[PDB]
Amino acid sequence: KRYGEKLKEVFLMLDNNVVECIKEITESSRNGKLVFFVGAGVSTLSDYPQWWRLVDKYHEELYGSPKKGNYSSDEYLRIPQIFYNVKGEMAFDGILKDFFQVDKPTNPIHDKILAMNPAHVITTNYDNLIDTACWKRGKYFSVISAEEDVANATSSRYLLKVHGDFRKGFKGENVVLKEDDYLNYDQNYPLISNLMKTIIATHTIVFIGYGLGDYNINMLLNWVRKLQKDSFHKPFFIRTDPSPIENETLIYYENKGLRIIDAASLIDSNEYDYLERYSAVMDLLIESQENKFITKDDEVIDYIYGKISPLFALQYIRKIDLKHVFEYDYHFEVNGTVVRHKNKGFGYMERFFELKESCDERSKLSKKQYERFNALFNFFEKNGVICMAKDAGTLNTSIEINSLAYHGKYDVMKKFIEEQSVSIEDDYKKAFFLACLGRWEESYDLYSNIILNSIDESNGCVYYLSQINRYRIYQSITQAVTQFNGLGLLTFGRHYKPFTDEFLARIEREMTNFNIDDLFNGMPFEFQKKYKILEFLSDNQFLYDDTVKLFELTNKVRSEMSEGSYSFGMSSDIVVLLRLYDNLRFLYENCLWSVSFHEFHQYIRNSMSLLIEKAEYERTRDIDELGFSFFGKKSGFFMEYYDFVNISRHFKIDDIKNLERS
Amino acid sequence: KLKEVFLMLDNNVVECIKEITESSRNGKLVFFVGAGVSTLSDYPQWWRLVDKYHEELYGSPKKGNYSSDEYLRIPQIFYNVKGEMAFDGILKDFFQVDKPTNPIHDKILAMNPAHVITTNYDNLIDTACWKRGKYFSVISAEEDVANATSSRYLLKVHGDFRKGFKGENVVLKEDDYLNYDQNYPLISNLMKTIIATHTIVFIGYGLGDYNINMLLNWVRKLQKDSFHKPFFIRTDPSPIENETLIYYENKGLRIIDAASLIDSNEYDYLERYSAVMDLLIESQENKFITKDDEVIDYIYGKISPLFALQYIRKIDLKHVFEYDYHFEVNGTVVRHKNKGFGYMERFFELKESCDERSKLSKKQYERFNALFNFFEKNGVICMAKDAGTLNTSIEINSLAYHGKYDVMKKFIEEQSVSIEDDYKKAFFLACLGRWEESYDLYSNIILNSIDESNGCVYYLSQINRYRIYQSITQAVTQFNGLGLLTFGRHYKPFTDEFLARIEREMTNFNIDDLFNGMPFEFQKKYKILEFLSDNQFLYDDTVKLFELTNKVRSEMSEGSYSFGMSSDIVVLLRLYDNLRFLYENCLWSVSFHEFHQYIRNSMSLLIEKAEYERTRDIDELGFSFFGKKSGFFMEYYDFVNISRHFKIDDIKNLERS
Ligand SMILES: NC(=O)c1ccc[n+]([C@@H]2O[C@H](COP(=O)([O-])OP(=O)(O)OC[C@H]3O[C@@H](n4cnc5c(N)ncnc54)[C@H](O)[C@@H]3O)[C@@H](O)[C@H]2O)c1
Numbered sequence A: 001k002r003y004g005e006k007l008k009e010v011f012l013m014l015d016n017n018v019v020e021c022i023k024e025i026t027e028s029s030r031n032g033k034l035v036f037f038v039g040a041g042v043s044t045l046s047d048y049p050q051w052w053r054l055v056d057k058y059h060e061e062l063y064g065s066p067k068k069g070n071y072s073s074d075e076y077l078r079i080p081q082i083f084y085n086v087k088g089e090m091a092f093d094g095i096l097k098d099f100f101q102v103d104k105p106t107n108p109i110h111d112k113i114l115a116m117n118p119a120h121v122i123t124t125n126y127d128n129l130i131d132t133a134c135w136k137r138g139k140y141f142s143v144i145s146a147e148e149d150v151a152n153a154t155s156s157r158y159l160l161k162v163h164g165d166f167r168k169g170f171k172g173e174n175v176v177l178k179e180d181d182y183l184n185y186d187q188n189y190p191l192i193s194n195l196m197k198t199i200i201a202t203h204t205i206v207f208i209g210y211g212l213g214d215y216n217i218n219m220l221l222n223w224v225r226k227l228q229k230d231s232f233h234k235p236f237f238i239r240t241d242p243s244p245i246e247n248e249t250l251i252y253y254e255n256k257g258l259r260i261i262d263a264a265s266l267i268d269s270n271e272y273d274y275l276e277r278y279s280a281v282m283d284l285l286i287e288s289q290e291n292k293f294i295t296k297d298d299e300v301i302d303y304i305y306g307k308i309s310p311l312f313a314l315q316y317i318r319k320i321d322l323k324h325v326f327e328y329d330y331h332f333e334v335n336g337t338v339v340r341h342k343n344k345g346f347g348y349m350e351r352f353f354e355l356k357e358s359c360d361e362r363s364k365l366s367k368k369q370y371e372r373f374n375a376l377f378n379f380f381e382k383n384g385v386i387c388m389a390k391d392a393g394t395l396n397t398s399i400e401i402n403s404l405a406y407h408g409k410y411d412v413m414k415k416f417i418e419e420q421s422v423s424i425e426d427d428y429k430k431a432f433f434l435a436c437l438g439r440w441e442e443s444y445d446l447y448s449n450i451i452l453n454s455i456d457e458s459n460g461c462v463y464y465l466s467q468i469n470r471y472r473i474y475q476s477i478t479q480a481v482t483q484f485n486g487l488g489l490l491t492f493g494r495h496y497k498p499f500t501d502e503f504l505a506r507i508e509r510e511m512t513n514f515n516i517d518d519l520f521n522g523m524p525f526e527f528q529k530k531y532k533i534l535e536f537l538s539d540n541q542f543l544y545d546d547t548v549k550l551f552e553l554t555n556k557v558r559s560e561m562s563e564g565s566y567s568f569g570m571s572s573d574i575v576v577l578l579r580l581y582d583n584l585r586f587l588y589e590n591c592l593w594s595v596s597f598h599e600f601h602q603y604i605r606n607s608m609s610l611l612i613e614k615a616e617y618e619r620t621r622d623i624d625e626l627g628f629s630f631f632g633k634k635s636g637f638f639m640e641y642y643d644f645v646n647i648s649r650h651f652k653i654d655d656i657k658n659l660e661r662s
Numbered sequence B: 001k002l003k004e005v006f007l008m009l010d011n012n013v014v015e016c017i018k019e020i021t022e023s024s025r026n027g028k029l030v031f032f033v034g035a036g037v038s039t040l041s042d043y044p045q046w047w048r049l050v051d052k053y054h055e056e057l058y059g060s061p062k063k064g065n066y067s068s069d070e071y072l073r074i075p076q077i078f079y080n081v082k083g084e085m086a087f088d089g090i091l092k093d094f095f096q097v098d099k100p101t102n103p104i105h106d107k108i109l110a111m112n113p114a115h116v117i118t119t120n121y122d123n124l125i126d127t128a129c130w131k132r133g134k135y136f137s138v139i140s141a142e143e144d145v146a147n148a149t150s151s152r153y154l155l156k157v158h159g160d161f162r163k164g165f166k167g168e169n170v171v172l173k174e175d176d177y178l179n180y181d182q183n184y185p186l187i188s189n190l191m192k193t194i195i196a197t198h199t200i201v202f203i204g205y206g207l208g209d210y211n212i213n214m215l216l217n218w219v220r221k222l223q224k225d226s227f228h229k230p231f232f233i234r235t236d237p238s239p240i241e242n243e244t245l246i247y248y249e250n251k252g253l254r255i256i257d258a259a260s261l262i263d264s265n266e267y268d269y270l271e272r273y274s275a276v277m278d279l280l281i282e283s284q285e286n287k288f289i290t291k292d293d294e295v296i297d298y299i300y301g302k303i304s305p306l307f308a309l310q311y312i313r314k315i316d317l318k319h320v321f322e323y324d325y326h327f328e329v330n331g332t333v334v335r336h337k338n339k340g341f342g343y344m345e346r347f348f349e350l351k352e353s354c355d356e357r358s359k360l361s362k363k364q365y366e367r368f369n370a371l372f373n374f375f376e377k378n379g380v381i382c383m384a385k386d387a388g389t390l391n392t393s394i395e396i397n398s399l400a401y402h403g404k405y406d407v408m409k410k411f412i413e414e415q416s417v418s419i420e421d422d423y424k425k426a427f428f429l430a431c432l433g434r435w436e437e438s439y440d441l442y443s444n445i446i447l448n449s450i451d452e453s454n455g456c457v458y459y460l461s462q463i464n465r466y467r468i469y470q471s472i473t474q475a476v477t478q479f480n481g482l483g484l485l486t487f488g489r490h491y492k493p494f495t496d497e498f499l500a501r502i503e504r505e506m507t508n509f510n511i512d513d514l515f516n517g518m519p520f521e522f523q524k525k526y527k528i529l530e531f532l533s534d535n536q537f538l539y540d541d542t543v544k545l546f547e548l549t550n551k552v553r554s555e556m557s558e559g560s561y562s563f564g565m566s567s568d569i570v571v572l573l574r575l576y577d578n579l580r581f582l583y584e585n586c587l588w589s590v591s592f593h594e595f596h597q598y599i600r601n602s603m604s605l606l607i608e609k610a611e612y613e614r615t616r617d618i619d620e621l622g623f624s625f626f627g628k629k630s631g632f633f634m635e636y637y638d639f640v641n642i643s644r645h646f647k648i649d650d651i652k653n654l655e656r657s
């Protein structure tokens, strides 16, 4: 608690450089492209026998007593080999076994490194501690200690254990410890050597547990020396030695390709408080990831703008989608009021609403922030966002859909189609209108053209939506052809051929072995991060949770005793109606063809029928409980133009008769 | 016609085709695309330019086959003597030209390759990609590796002229090849890491290619049998001899000579390409069930992982076989969306006939026995058309269902011997009133399941622990706020430290990603369990109940009287199947409120239908002797269900109605 503030004090103290390091690392963490090269120090915390202690065992067994001290890199690798060569190989394995067979505990740092959502973890350790913490937390990684495993992996995420491991047996052949092990590494570990390097090239590397004079750190530095300048992202280093890095050192290693983050300088601790140093440099990143470090109105404005700007390409956003956009930090209700939800940090949305309420506070902001605030205000007013539920009141709700297709303006749609397009969005709307009028070959051609142009235009959204709509158009064409060939000729009295053989053959040939499941995955990770809410558009079926939620309308105990638990003092009727309206508006305003499928019609029918049945039952129970004059002819369900058109479009004669007689 | 080709395909060919297809359905195939593919699109073959340099340098063509040396030297002699400008001039002239995406390009992208490494300077693979609508990050220069934005890559290992038709952006002359790893260290490694972790299928190269031969000399060094032998799609007119087939096969390759697959004239290239490319590999994407033993092996492969569980819902089986057949609640099997050999019908025929079972070879009768036992226990009887007199029975062996609390206490007290006993003990503790002990035991099981296993018990323990934590949180919420008034005292079932610890431990846990984070092998083997992590477990049954309620109430209003089987039997069958599945697998989902509501609705509809069918014996039997006898009557299981899943208000309402 007090330290929490001290962590923030450290955070305040962080020079721009440490903040930048933390910044890129935290962004990388989120992108899914961080890797941690975890060395020995992170396990000396768990007391895993340090190496000098084993090099020392060998010195004492070999010659007779411990060395002077300061084993260099050479002695680190040669005393093990001398013993191996002179005292034996089966003894070498016994010394190892005695020290390394001891099961140690798992440190706090092991879960922090894993808390940052590391894409992979490279490690020059034989211990199975990263590999146990992984399991405790549930993070499944593919451990690669041996060459044989490089190809027999399962996940793309990896626990690359360079320098082997004792999973197969405590023998110095299953690990890299002595001089020859390190000398012939490339020859004896070709695939693991490469896997480490490709990962270093692509993902961001944050070293933790190594010295700057470590053998491995300086080996990688010589490889990176070869790499082309700016062909690689510089790796970060976490120096947890117990003192400030001599500025000279900082520079040399900085130029060699490191970006040190000395903990000794970021906090103050005793000479032997190694864990403290780790936690300091490690916590700044963890908290920073959570965006807990934020105080200014400009900061929350920038955060919300960065989160919201990509959605401007759309026309309407469902209230449920906003929950996923903000990562469950807030609940977005159909009523338009938003509430806090598992948010441990600054109330940025509270600040945004407070700014909206008061003009002077808005004037306090800068000019660019003022423009961003204006844009966000416009977007929120369009999508229907109100202040917090605490500050709520007699909020109203009206349904309005801006779409010529919904209102059946066939003449206006044809006139628009006949016009000359000016933008790709106009082409998308034209294709949707063509599909709505039954002209499906023209819609397919226009969607193909839009797909061809968007990829070059860098319009990922239109590209994705056009691909989905083209697939749906192809499916509709296929089912229509099957129906016409199966029964169309009989009922019509004559065989009808709306589509020529050449077009059918061409579409069959072009869309062969097509898979809509992998469409979203292949898009760049930037798009997947910005527009994740659209993933559900690629699923085979949807609107299942909404259908399941209809059970509440079938409840009977509510009439005897109802608490209005749904939302805040709202019945399930209003919630379901607003959910249906939101779904309808989102589908119709975004020009999506999925409206024309059986599932949507069935969902609409079920919702409307259950709502009307609940209204009738409520009226009957009200009449029964009180006198007949009380609600004798009261109508618990009120209809409007939108309900009329919905019923007309989505109900059959049998459904209407069943509703009327029910 | 390809049927004959298929028939002819030797075991070798079909084995190659099998692995290539299967790797693709997993997402691990990679195509090494060479020059030939682009010559199908009449792109200047290299020797055309080697010969252009050999003419502007010397004065004529080499009138001979360019060796591996002259391919790389003639370009360099010209560069060293005629300069960079002209070198790049001929480059612009021959290569600044548009050519069409040949058919083989699309075939390749139809295999949905994970990556496409290529030694081509052209952009034909890239165009086919955009046209197909398949994205790939193109890496053709060192810098591109660090700035890529996708997992998939179009690694152009010899550069491309996308940055201009200069020779500085490509590998063609000799110095470029000699200093390759020095100049392209990142792309060199990337290719090699993919080769190691993906199945490579070369296409567009000859066995004597410089590149093919260099890769093979590196695989020699791998020297740990840690590499998947790369397939090589030969497509030269003549048939590959045997001496070479042996030598190059030993050197690391798996040749698939198209000449052997299909006969052709000396210059029929797109023909040899297509046959091996799609008319075989792509056309063989399906199964090859043609023997009495392959049926048993396939069924055992699809059914073995389910042995870890105790019972399987019949409806869920629809997803096990990928919609190949419809499984009905009454135990009947119907064909649906299956165009290949009928293997379940063959299995049923073998079950009926003992001689067919005797025909099975050794080591396969035990698998048939296990499958027969599993199907008999699950209740699958036979195919629909051969249906006999189906029967209905109820049997739940779960101890907690019958409310034998003392027996569960004794079981908990007794020592455990296997993690299954620990799971049962955790379920018993949850059903007895110990949330802390159940949580601790679930955590213990999660910790101790590190050893090799199917990963099922670990996943179920995680889900159960999450649900138990949710129940603990709700209990605390209604204790600290309402427990004071309910009992008049501040009841403290759990200490603050335990609550804080459990809150801290899973503050980052997200049930949504629990299934995705599991190994890929588990996902393709135990996919049915995914629905256990959301309300999708109870979607189809609820819709069916709604439809049946609507139909039954419509018939009630009409007043018709059928003389056949009751139309609400499916509701009872689904209800009992769901109860058995949830109770025999020791799952906490039995405690959910939506499950209680569904049970209440189903039994209320059943009771209403029974009450209506009770009174019909006075109208239909009063005007004519013709009538019916079938009905519904109370029993122990229904009594327990009602006592557990109904409130006093619902029972009073049913009594009134
Ligand atoms: N060969 C030797 O130099 C030698 C000989 C005898 C004793 N020691 C002892 O070993 C200790 C560490 O030296 P080293 O061999 O690891 O090389 P080192 O000090 O270069 O270690 C590099 C990294 O290991 C981490 N680390 C070191 N000791 C740690 C600890 N106790 N807990 C957590 N992290 C730790 C540090 O954060 C550092 O970043 C020294 O304090 C020294 O007393 C070293």
Ligand SMILES: NC(=O)c1ccc[n+]([C@@H]2O[C@H](COP(=O)([O-])OP(=O)(O)OC[C@H]3O[C@@H](n4cnc5c(N)ncnc54)[C@H](O)[C@@H]3O)[C@@H](O)[C@H]2O)c1
Pocket (backbone or CB within 6 Å): B035, B036, B037, B039, B040, B045, B047, B064, B065, B066, B204, B205, B206, B207, B234, B235, B236, B237, B269, B270
């Ligand atoms: N040796 C030369 O440099 C040279 C000189 C002049 C003419 N040619 C002519 O060019 C042809 C191929 O020359 P190469 O040295 O590249 O052969 P190659 O064997 O090196 O070709 C490599 C791969 O490309 C394939 N391939 C060859 N021609 C193809 C085509 N037109 N379409 C599709 N795939 C094709 C081959 O089957 C082989 O698998 C020869 O038939 C020859 O008549 C070659």
